[PDB]
Design a binder for this molecule. Structure first.
Ligand SMILES: *[C@@H]1O[C@H](CO)[C@@H](O[C@@H]2O[C@H](CO)[C@@H](O)[C@H](O)[C@H]2NC(C)=O)[C@H](O)[C@H]1NC(C)=O
Ligand SMILES: *[C@@H]1O[C@H](CO)[C@@H](O)[C@H](O)[C@H]1NC(C)=O
Lengths: 56, 177
């Protein structure tokens, strides 16, 4: 996509009541938004080329 | 068939007995007619119904594939995952197919048995008060009206009550007329 540089992303699950401490000096791509895991349950990542069928 | 009754000594079945799987055809002075045997047909429905339920139930737990992704240097575990999951679809397909084939034979042979046993039920009620004709039918040595017929159909035939008339007829037949 026209770029010879690279971006490498990382992640963690930060438990309630815990903190994440960054320190940097260059090349940091900082978080702005993060995701609360509001509900857990059965799901899956289906691989399909199809689209929403307005059905149940 | 294993029991030699359906498409055996009884050659072909009755389009005209509609209210059961096994039953009777009778013929006497007052006419003729078909009548299902309720009790045998019911045992059969019970059997087959239970069978279909047992199959559904035993196939209830059974392997359920789940998708997992792997990167370009996890090819050995991606292959081990594919093969594991294909391995179970194969075990389970064999199990379903083979259960179906094996139980179909038993079912078809079950009905065959059921007709043989019903034939034998009538045979051992009547004994020498009737003559086995060989095609699935009995010819009585005595007059058997609709009340007498029902007694055959429902387990109640009184052999002693007709045996005298029976011995007189057998006597006439051996003597030549
Ligand atoms: C994140 O913030 C909370 C305060 O808002 C901290 O809560 C204290 O944490 C200690 C040690 O974990 C607990 O035993 C106390 O219940 C809390 N103290 C007070 C005065 O509320 C928490 O420690 C912070 N987490 C980190 C990793 O620094
Ligand atoms: C069986 O057949 C006879 C008819 O000859 C009838 O009178 C009798 O009540 C029947 N028995 C039963 C239990 O249905």
């Amino acid at each position: 996509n026209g770029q010879s540089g690279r971006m490498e992303f990382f992640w963690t699950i930060l438990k309630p009541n815990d903190a994440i401490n960054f320190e940097s000096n260059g090349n940091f791509i900082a978080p702005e938004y993060a995701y609360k895991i509001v509900k857990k349950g059965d799901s899956t990542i289906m691989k399909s080329e199809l689209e929403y069928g307005n059905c149940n | 068939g294993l029991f030699g009754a359906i498409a055996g000594f009884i050659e072909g079945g009755w389009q005209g007995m509609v209210d059961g799987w096994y039953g009777y055809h009778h013929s006497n002075e007052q006419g003729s007619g078909y009548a299902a045997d309720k009790e045998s047909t019911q045992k059969a429905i019970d059997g087959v119904t239970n069978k279909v339920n047992s199959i559904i139930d035993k196939m209830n737990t059974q392997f359920e594939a789940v998708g997992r992704e792997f990167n370009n240097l996890e090819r050995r575990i991606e292959n081990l995952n594919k093969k594991m999951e294909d391995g179970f679809l194969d075990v389970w397909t064999y199990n379903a197919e083979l259960l179906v084939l094996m139980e179909n034979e038993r079912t078809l042979d079950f009905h065959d048995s059921n007709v043989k046993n019903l034939y034998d039920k009538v045979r051992l009620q009547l004994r020498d008060n009737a003559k086995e004709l060989g095609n699935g039918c009995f010819e009585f040595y005595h007059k058997c009206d609709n009340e007498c017929m029902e007694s055959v159909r429902n387990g109640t035939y009184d052999y002693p009550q007709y045996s005298e008339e029976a011995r007189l007829k057998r006597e006439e037949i051996s003597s030549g007329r």
